Symmetry: C2
Subunit: 133 residues, 2 copies
Amino acid sequence: TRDQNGTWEMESNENFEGYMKALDIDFCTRKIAVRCTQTKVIDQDGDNFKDKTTSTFRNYDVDFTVGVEFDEYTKSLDNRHVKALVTWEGDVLVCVQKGEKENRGWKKWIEGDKLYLELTCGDQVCRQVFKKK
Amino acid sequence: TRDQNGTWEMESNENFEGYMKALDIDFCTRKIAVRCTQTKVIDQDGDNFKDKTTSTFRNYDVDFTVGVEFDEYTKSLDNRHVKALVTWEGDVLVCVQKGEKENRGWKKWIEGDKLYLELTCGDQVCRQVFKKK
């Protein structure tokens, strides 16, 4: 068939690195690109094609129980050893990551339709807001 | 509520670069990670949490008509000017991107529930497989 319409999810990607390297893509872009899965949405009627491709990489995965200290290696991010403790403060989830960096941790809370995540390291604070889908 | 279950889509992200820099993430990966919007998937069961974060960047949008040569920039990858021509070879969609790189192009075709994509540049072949959702 010539019909390529639809939503296509990547399941393998062989030698993307060498193809991008032949196109002189910068090292740091290639390092992340080879970790991305692609989703291609193709719309085709007659000779006319529209292709929308999105790339996603699995950015951080962590399991924990509130109140139970655990060692983790911040593999994915900075790759350090911390001893993390997550506790409730009211309805706010509070995580302290004890280790090399001072004031390292995060807070997560819900307000209505929105999840708020405050990330801290040193004197830097990152505020993120997510909408429930 | 102490319920953070669900799928959550990023709608705001302030001072991400500063927090990442304070953790010592190479300039390279930060200016990539900032480019992306995130999705958080939280599975919460009592005191136990499973958090899976992913990052997405919109990426390549392409419109072409088969058999019509057109100039384009290869935005998405190296952003070079090519004259692209997409034609059918039987059921295989073949694209030649004429310009600075030799043997530059791609081929894609359906077999069963799967889409096969071969990308070429120079002596490099990248082979991708997608599954129809």
